Amino acid sequence: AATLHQLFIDQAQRTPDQVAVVFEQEWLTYSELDQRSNQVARFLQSRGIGRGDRVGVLAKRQVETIINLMAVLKAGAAYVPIDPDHPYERQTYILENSSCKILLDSDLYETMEISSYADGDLTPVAEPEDTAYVIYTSGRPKGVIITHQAASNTIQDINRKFEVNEEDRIIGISSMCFDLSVYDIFGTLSAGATLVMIRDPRDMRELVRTVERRGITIWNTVPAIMDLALDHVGSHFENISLRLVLLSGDWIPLPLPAKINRHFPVADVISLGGATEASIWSIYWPIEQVEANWKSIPYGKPLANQTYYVLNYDQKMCPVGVIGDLYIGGAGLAQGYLNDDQKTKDAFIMHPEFGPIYKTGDCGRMRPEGYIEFLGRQDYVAPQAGLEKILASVWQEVLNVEQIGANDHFFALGGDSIKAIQVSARLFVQGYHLDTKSLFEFPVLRDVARTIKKLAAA
Amino acid sequence: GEQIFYWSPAKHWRMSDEGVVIGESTYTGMILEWFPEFYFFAQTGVTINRLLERFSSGSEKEANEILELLIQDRVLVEGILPPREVFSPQEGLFVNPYSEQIRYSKEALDYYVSEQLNRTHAACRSTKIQLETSGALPDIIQKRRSCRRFDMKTPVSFATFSNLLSSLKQRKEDKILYNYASAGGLYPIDVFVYVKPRRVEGVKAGFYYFNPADHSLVLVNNIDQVIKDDHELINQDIFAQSAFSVYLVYNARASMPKYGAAGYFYACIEAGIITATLNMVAEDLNVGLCSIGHMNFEEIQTFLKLEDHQVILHAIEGGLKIDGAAAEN
Amino acid sequence: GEQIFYWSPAKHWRMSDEGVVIGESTYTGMILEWFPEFYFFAQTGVTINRLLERFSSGSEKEANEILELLIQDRVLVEGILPPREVFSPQEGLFVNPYSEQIRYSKEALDYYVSEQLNRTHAACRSTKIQLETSGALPDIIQKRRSCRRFDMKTPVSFATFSNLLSSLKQRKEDKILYNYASAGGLYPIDVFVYVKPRRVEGVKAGFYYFNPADHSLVLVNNIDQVIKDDHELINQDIFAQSAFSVYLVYNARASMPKYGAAGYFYACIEAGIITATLNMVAEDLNVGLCSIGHMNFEEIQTFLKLEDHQVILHAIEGGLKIDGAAAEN
Ligand SMILES: *P(=O)(O)OCC(C)(C)[C@@H](O)C(=O)NCCC(=O)NCCS[C@@H](CS(=O)(=O)NC[C@H]1O[C@@H](n2cnc3c(N)ncnc32)[C@H](O)[C@@H]1O)[C@@H](N)CS
Ligand SMILES: Cc1cc2nc3c(=O)[nH]c(=O)nc-3n(C[C@H](O)[C@H](O)[C@H](O)COP(=O)(O)O)c2cc1C
Ligand SMILES: Cc1cc2nc3c(=O)[nH]c(=O)nc-3n(C[C@H](O)[C@H](O)[C@H](O)COP(=O)(O)O)c2cc1C
């Protein structure tokens, strides 16, 4: 599978007029993305960017960001995504810790007049053993070094196991600072499919309209996004464009496949997850319908070119199951942590009877049915209106409290992003069909009440 | 390189104690000092930047908020107005002698209609010439009806679809000719079609521009699609069943340089000429059509990537007529 | 009992050092003190008497002079605007990329036309579907041409004239039906005909209102007549030869109570539907027709004794096609 950018070039020659990536009103075809990524890649080389370098890119929800990413890979260098909403001190840490030379934003192709550079093919630079991207997690944060050979193995097997082709349309919900997006960008391109970018990932109502309006066929998020979105969905809703749901990240709730099957009766929902420390994904397990219901959803078998182990204290396989630590190996393994030898030596180790392995830190057991089950990881006043009381009651059930001041900031009870959507989702269900966001921009309980009620349905 | 905005002809105004009345809304804040000079300035065509330099005097964030709202509320516009905005001031000129319940009550409307269908001009004299009905009318004219339910299984054959759309093509014969009339022979109506999946043999879903010179469809947009929420409630089942959607678009650049504003008027007439012409070829080919007065044209206009000099005038839903079932595909 | 006048939507304004700018004219005298409050007052509908009481303050002769001129110059109007006034503000919104010589030079126009007939939408993709011309079109559609010279000797037979006008009549069949479409089935276009002497068998010269419910002509005016100076120079020979003139008139009372301003828009579309429908029945009966965009409708409107809620949208000249001579009578 060579490199990530080579899979795009080969497919861009097959279907040059196919849409490559769409945001809102202007979008790039495969020939357009190839022409503008070549022009910027030559611009990077004029600044001395070559093999072994690392380039910072800002993960804004614009088609220019796709060009910069592809242009960095074409220059032979790896890219490090930077969240534009992160504070300056955290953005600065990653840029200096990763030893990046420059940072690319959306102000480049027009600002530097790069439309004048050459738009033709560039004799390759990167090899499959080269680093494609370094992404930082657990913000202090640690970077993960993923190679081109590794990132291509995960992407190639998803598309071939699920027959991703030109007719597919992938909704780009995950932020590019999260490794999941790599399939939304590169896995989509390697099959000739179209990527639809999302302006706001926490606007659940817009996510629903986007799937219906643009005929989205592939959904690839953390299961929390699908469960929160289907709580902004009426009881009589039904969509037949979505044909594949890839869920990974955090636990996988049991009531969620029931929601997915009832609203997308044609979607093949797949329960997976493969640790960012490896190629993004590593485990493959389709919901094989449901003939079994207990208390947990099993992880699955290795995706491809990867292995799984339940190991004890001497790094030996636990017999006929035996809950233990979870290890992975194969072609998906990362090179290591960037500029941290202590974490790399502890996490990436050598197996006495097999190739290198990585310690996920998760706990689990091999079921006698052939699948591994996930068993956890780390061991050790009064309202002034009826509408204010209803809104407080929703804050009470989501945040588990009693009575609150209307001026208590929504996170005075520990409220976060996921619980912010949970609050507005329940407000949406009962008939307050307005702004389901705007929970942190408006601290006052009443200010949210004036924003969520009125108008609503029609 | 900057966008130039004009005061909308559809918006009339007044100054007030409350604030600046524009249309049906009263505005407050910076906009009160900018006015009325802002009105005078805006008919001439001004950019956002020039407006800020002239009126900002303070927070450019405070100046941008009022400018953003006048563009949003369509008081400041970037190009020609759609028909609905053109005609909106006429409501203040028509004295309505009937009750509003005609629009809300099927019983009040059924009576208003029967009165309007037996109306006569008031200045009629007491002389009469009874003519003759003895004539015969072509069935394609006399049997045309508005079809609001279509065969959703049998695809429109590629031959049928080609024949229907050949009514709009060019004919080279010492001079370019069409099969329908056009003020000044300028033919400024762009014709677009949205085709639903599997409903027209040979045509993938998507928005196409019909080029009458080649007799070809040229794709504009296969990503987006028309949905039922883009249609008025009373029309959503018409659209649901239909195989394709026709959109009649006025190209001001093909008309106004010669006839001025009357070319926009002529294109509205020409839209009807096209609509009626279409509905007859359709009857010849056992295709049904139904004209659609209103729909979310703001979205369709965006899907078709129309320019500032193009506005959608009319829409038509079409498909094969019911007569026999088929295998479900 | 007093007449109520409204500020015309087609007129936009500005205050000046010179005086009161309204449209393309600057006004002087009393009107400078009355303004701008007069503008605000006038959109609401005011009489001449009420205006005098409020603004006269002096010579009622001096007050009447400015009121007489604002009504004459169409700044103050008594009813719905004709199409040409409706669309007039659009000139300030259309940026023309061509030179004015298209309108003054047959050579500049012939080039502008050929460019507009080979135009395409700019947002077209590089995909194509070549359809099929193999089809057959009805001769009544494909052979219709604009006829600008008519047989001035052979009278239109009473049967032929009756058949042509039967395209517009009603049909009772559990519900009133026409042979052509109409937004909401309200059919708000009044149809009038002017017949020249001796040119239509059975019909004396004069203006008639066609009643579609009876299928009858009802005289409106036999005293006045249409002349060549009522027509644009380029059309005077069309009218000279023609046997009759059709006038399409919008009856706001048959439409606007239901659809508001959009009903005026719909009637403009319906006028084209009628025009096109007519031109096909005519081809079936070897009658020629030619649509007329502009003419002195201010006079024709007066001859027909139209009310405030009626405006003329379109005119058509018609007659028998040339093929053989006859005895001069
Ligand atoms: P607010 O504004 O902050 O709200 C928005 C937020 C940020 C809350 C929300 O929109 C959001 O999370 N948006 C980001 C998109 C997204 O999906 N981000 C998640 C990263 S995807 C990546 C995570 S990971 O799997 O690598 N984490 C590794 C680690 O997770 C555990 N794990 C994951 N799936 C598991 C399953 N199914 N079962 C057990 N454990 C699972 C493992 O321990 C694994 O090692 C994924 N896509 C790549 S694998
Ligand atoms: C501009 C226009 C818009 C129309 N819109 C609708 C519509 O939205 N829904 C509908 O059911 N019929 C619609 N019609 C159909 C006619 O209003 C009417 O039902 C019929 O066409 C009158 O003659 P017919 O019944 O023989 O077709 C429309 C017609 C016109 C001319
Ligand atoms: C609204 C309208 C007004 C027209 N006015 C005139 C006119 O004043 N004089 C004229 O010679 N032709 C006039 N025509 C004829 C057409 O502009 C054009 O000459 C011809 O109809 C195009 O197709 P045809 O030549 O097959 O009829 C008019 C057509 C339309 C639609």
Residue numbers in the entry:
A (entry chain A): 1297 to 1435, 1439 to 1679, 1784 to 1861
B (entry chain B), C (entry chain B): 2 to 330
Text lifted from the article:
The bacillamide biosynthetic pathway is a common, three-protein system, with a decarboxylase that prepares an NRPS substrate, an NRPS, and an oxidase. The oxidase is shown to perform dehydrogenation of the thiazoline in the peptide intermediate while it is covalently attached to the NRPS, as the penultimate step in bacillamide D synthesis. The oxidase forms a stable complex with the NRPS and dimerizes it. We visualized co-complexes of the oxidase bound to the elongation module of the NRPS using X-ray crystallography and cryo-EM.
BmdBM2–BmdC complex is a very elongated dimeric structure in which the two BmdB modules are kept far apart, and in which the active sites accessed by PCP2 form a catalytic arc. The center of the complex is BmdC in the same dimeric configuration described above. The area of the BmdC Ox domain most distal from the dimeric interface (residues 223–231 and 303–306) makes a small interface with one end of the A domain (residues 1321–1323, 1468, 1512–1513), burying 491 Å2 of surface area per protein. This positions the two BmdBM2 modules in a plane perpendicular to the BmdC rotational axis, stretching out at ~45° to the core BmdC dimer interface. The configuration is extremely oblong, with the BmdBM2:BmdC complex having overall dimensions of 65 Å by 65 Å by 280 Å and placing the Cy2 domains on either side of the massive complex. Surprisingly, A2sub is disordered, despite no visible impediment to its binding in its classic thiolation position, suggesting A2sub may not be required to help position PCP2 for aminoacylation. In the catalytic cycle of module 2, PCP2 must visit A2 for thiolation/aminoacylation to ligate the cysteine substrate (forming Cys-S-PCP2), then the Cy2 domain for condensation and heterocyclization (forming AlaCysthiazoline-S-PCP2) and the BmdC Ox domain for oxidation (forming AlaCysthiazole-S-PCP2).
